[PDB]
Symmetry: C4
Subunit: 335 residues, 4 copies
């Protein structure tokens, strides 16, 4: 029985090979941004409300035309067969059963059509390829397979400097492949427009940190953004998304959904993100800890724990709905 | 001989069973709010005044129609027989002898009538029960028994996630029971009004952190509030009461008594709370350390030590009265 | 050869009995104010000036009608025979030879007349006694013996709670006595006026932290103040003097000399104090480390080291005089 | 293969004699300014831009009439034969090959003419000598030998207090000499004018921290300044250059080039400096680590690594040029 997400990290470190744990845990450069994602959440304190009606507390949201059970989705994480033989299928099944959106990756180790066939109304994460037509074909494949949103990753013109991976000499095992293929080009605003013109699905730009990039995303017709430094894996020294979130929420002024990720490790952290104005969060590494530890059942247990922590935090803060949580105030503290 | 409250924690850890010490010491979740209560006090520095008349320094206050010997009351702590066989009777006797109000709990391990019979003009802490009539009956019992205030706990719609208790598998021993009974409903503003209509006693709302909840408490006819995050035991990530206190004192503008709790560990901390505008503080865990260490005599020694530290701090700060201490200025520092 | 003041603390800890080292090193309560004195200096950074004329750098000041070789005096420290058999005579001789004022204490372990006979134009520190006439007699004795200023300590209505001393059971050895006597009353503004009326010497109020107490000191006819929390030995939680200094300097607006003490451990710290607006600093514990380590010669070496560090810091900061150092700007940093 | 600059420090500590490593690593006094240079960079976070054209990312700048391959030059470091037998020649050759300016020192252990003969369009660092004519002769020698800028060090009226060197009893080995000679006077604004009148080369004032000294530098006809606390080696307690940089850039308002140094340890740090407004950075200690570890080849590898890290950071931040990097915004964080 896991009582916190930290129980799952401990379990994952026990089971995973060192170099795979490092691929998962690590960030770029000195890992300043990786650590800052945690620091940034730990400095935020919530000002809870008391004495409100909690007779029907609901953690549900509506996002991109679907009801989700929590203000949370599984972040795109490449190559999930690194962590468990069932890889993406195990995670997608658990997410479906929990009513949480699952983000299918361009670099999934099981094909996007197979993962979509699990059900649960999935999203699809896009990397822009040097061959543009390949990019747009992936989008069409995703849409044909029933994916509900295109999560266009905009903070990877190329991969950051992963010093753990360099020092370990990390490479994919022969049994883990990019199953959507039988090489990255930097994406631009023109690429965003090409995607927006090629699909009826909401386009969500993942990796926005500058306020004017958030504004431009709305002007470009994005249905959402994810305020994110890519888990500290891209620019080392990039500001945490949680530190830009409030300013971005104010600037977009309801023009698109504003998600955040990086370091969400509890329902309390979800509450903090919501109180800062997020529509929803993504959770990355902890989902992989659960997958590594106990496969589909592990992910189920993680999502059940997160669901309980979110409900607990919301009610203790006087919030019968996620909208009420967005109206909570916060105060910065120390360490 | 104890020269600081930390001497008492050391003594309590030596004697108490691990799981009972954890029940006492612990907070919810990651214990962020528990630690922050201490951090928040440690960052506050007092700007003392010099050269004032100290020929009759008094630490007394008038609160809820009684003179108290210190600007302090014993916080409500459930199930005091966990810590010593005499439980609530030992603590209430020592509080009476020291001239400090004692808060009798809804979940007292000795009946409220027995504890009230000790004397010392006691307060009564109320949890709202699913059976409303039971709640109001407790209030009437408390009033009939001579309790002087109803401390309505408003931050426990349900109990927080106590991970130490979960990991220890903590349960009450068979010899510790809720002696007022022969199950919690979330309280609302309607519940507050039902209590206010059922008693002539001052109603004090314990667990207020939002400024508008403090204002609403005054509008609702509360005689006081306790600005509190429940010792870090309820919402993990709730702001410390000490960080909201000044803003709350300004907002209520003398409309009710404003108490604070969480992490008060010395007379200097009492002085800080007073300088930030508190009418009085509650002290929880240290009273239980003293009870565990040496029963009634332990609590007596703790209160004597606190009394000396409060007098010392006040005089060194140029304050002949608690009112003068409330007019002291403060300055935030680091670590 | 000592190259920093920290070399002297190490030497003093080696030689002194534990309880005497604790009497010297310790503060009140949790020692929060003791530690904060150091933290407060460490957070201040100087913005040095370049390319200024340094052909005649002088560290001299004029204060209370005497030229001093440095913007520094030896703080009042009671019972110096605790640290070395020559006690106050050793320190006073070294201070005289270095051109630094020495503060003779009310609780000196050698009589004030003997210490004054050393020469060097000494100051006299006054504690207010329950017998007022005794207080004023000490002032007259000091003036008759050639003391140049009365340093009236205003932050000791009684002694703070010295937990190291309590735990050690510290008491003076039989061979250390208060040599000025053959019991403290709290001083008030009336006491200050009684002293001011009884002497032509400048009266300096030591232990001022509140801005309005600094203003009142000027209105009361004080020739100076020492902005000070008594080395963290009095109110535990009192703000460091260095944190109030700039605001106090602005408020008194040249109306009296403004000294500071607490945690000065280098010439760089002297420069910081000067840049924040101090006329001069007092140095306490390090002078006693030097006395303990090597008697008069130790104090000589300490003052020579401090003199070199002050000259070094001033010149590197582009300051040919202490007045120029007072015009330096500062910036707060972290840790 | 080195993947970070920290790999090079480890390698240098392994090979160098302790006292030489200390000469290199150390700062003045308590090393507060040395540590603060690192702290100051670690607190700065970049707000990257996304989705910009990165088809021709260039790290080049034009400075003092030459194209440089990076916004970086090798800082002046005296006596490079302390670290490797080839000393300055090894470093200058690697800098030339990398297209990075190299600063030839007044206290070079190989003559300035020999180092200039390496090629690569070098700069010359000037210390003001007690014999003025000697100073101006060095300038003329430098200009005759093809140096492109005079980097006048303005923060060394004399050497700071290097406690590591004092404790080690550090002295130059007999085989390391000041090769430009067959003693320092404090420089003033008059000295700057004498240099400016004696050369057509741009004069760059190294060691400026005060905003009005930056303004005065422009008024005095400086072509650049280096905002610097001399690597924490001069005034202990001097503010880090990185903390003054933004204010200085605003004040000079394009009137001269504004460089910064102190603690640059990665391409990410270069990006931070650029985002705060620097034209370029200097790098000191890491170049010497590389020299100690592996001579010319070591310095080559260091500069290749820095070049890759700068390109990586710029592109991840959406910057196709250094000018675009200067337009990035930053946000302060914690630890
Ligand atoms: C092992 C790993 C692989 C990832 N792969 C991708 C990816 O292919 N596409 C993408 O947009 N983000 C990717 N991310 C970033 C995550 O979507 C997310 O931004 C980050 O993990 C969130 O932080 P968290 O792990 O702290 O919850 C990856 C993260 C990790 C740890
Ligand atoms: C073991 C324990 C039991 C508690 N029981 C109650 C309770 O029944 N009702 C209540 O309002 N507060 C309860 N509290 C909270 C305290 O009244 C108080 O808010 C908190 O302990 C103050 O912080 P301190 O312990 O840091 O002094 C309890 C606290 C502890 C540690
Ligand atoms: C052992 C000791 C004895 C002291 N005695 C006196 C005293 O008799 N009168 C007084 O005004 N201050 C006294 N002080 C306070 C000092 O004058 C001074 O405020 C403090 O030591 C300055 O801080 P520093 O020790 O950090 O330099 C004493 C301090 C110490 C450490
Ligand atoms: C061993 C050593 C010698 C130095 N010699 C000189 C010098 O002769 N002239 C000068 O202007 N700066 C000198 N500096 C300062 C550097 O130019 C530069 O300001 C500092 O090293 C930059 O910080 P960094 O080492 O953190 O990169 C020296 C620094 C070191 C570490
Ligand atoms: O300034 C803010 O309030 C915001 O940028 C912020 C959010 C989280 C945090 O930890 C620090 C700052
Ligand atoms: O963070 C990752 O590992 C993932 O986003 C990624 C995978 C391949 C790649 O080229 C760049 C990024
Ligand atoms: O802003 C304040 O002054 C107040 O919120 C506060 C009180 C105590 C504290 O530690 C930090 C902040
Ligand atoms: O903090 C506690 O333990 C106390 O307030 C409490 C007791 C029972 C309960 O259901 C909720 C809270
Ligand atoms: O606010 C200030 O500048 C002043 O109070 C201060 C001085 C020193 C210090 O460390 C912190 C604050
Ligand atoms: O700090 C001290 O020890 C000194 O100021 C002092 C001495 C005797 C006393 O009663 C009070 C203070
Ligand atoms: O105030 C600022 O923004 C600037 O002085 C600064 C730069 C870097 C830093 O770490 C702290 C402050
Ligand atoms: O930092 C140094 O070591 C260098 O700048 C220097 C060399 C000789 C000197 O006299 C002063 C400074």
């Amino acid at each position: 029985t896991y009582v916190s997400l930290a129980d799952l990290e401990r379990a994952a470190r026990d089971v995973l090979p060192g170099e795979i744990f490092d691929f998962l845990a690590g960030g770029s450069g000195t890992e300043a941004s990786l650590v800052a994602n945690r620091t940034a959440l730990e400095r935020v304190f919530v000002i809870p409300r008391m004495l409100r009606d909690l007779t029907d507390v609901t953690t549900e949201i509506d996002i991109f035309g679907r009801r989700a059970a929590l203000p949370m989705a599984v972040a795109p994480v490449a190559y999930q067969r690194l962590f468990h033989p069932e890889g993406e299928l195990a995670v997608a099944r658990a997410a479906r059963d929990a009513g949480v959106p699952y983000t299918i990756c361009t670099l999934s180790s099981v094909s996007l059509e197979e993962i979509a066939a699990v059900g649960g109304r999935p999203w699809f994460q896009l990397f822009w390829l040097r061959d543009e037509k390949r990019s747009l074909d992936l989008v069409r494949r995703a849409e044909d397979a029933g994916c509900e949103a295109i999560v266009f990753t905009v903070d990877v013109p190329w991969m950051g400097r992963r010093l753990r991976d360099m020092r370990n000499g990390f490479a994919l095992p022969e049994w883990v492949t990019a199953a959507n293929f039988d090489e990255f080009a930097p994406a631009t605003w023109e690429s965003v427009e090409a995607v927006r013109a090629h699909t009826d699905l909401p386009v969500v730009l993942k990796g926005i940190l500058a306020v004017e990039d958030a504004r431009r995303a709305v002007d470009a017709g994005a249905g959402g953004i994810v305020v994110s430094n890519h888990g500290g894996r891209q620019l080392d020294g990039a500001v945490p998304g949680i530190e830009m979130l409030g300013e971005i929420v104010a600037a977009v002024s309801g023009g698109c959904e504003v998600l955040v990720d990086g370091g969400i490790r509890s329902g309390g952290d979800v509450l903090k993100a919501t109180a800062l104005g997020a529509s929803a969060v993504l959770v990355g590494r902890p989902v992989m800890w659960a997958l590594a530890a106990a496969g589909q059942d592990g992910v189920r247990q993680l999502l059940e724990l997160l669901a309980e922590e979110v409900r607990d935090a919301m009610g203790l803060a006087g919030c019968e709905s996620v909208g009420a949580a967005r109206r909570l105030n916060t105060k910065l503290g120390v360490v």
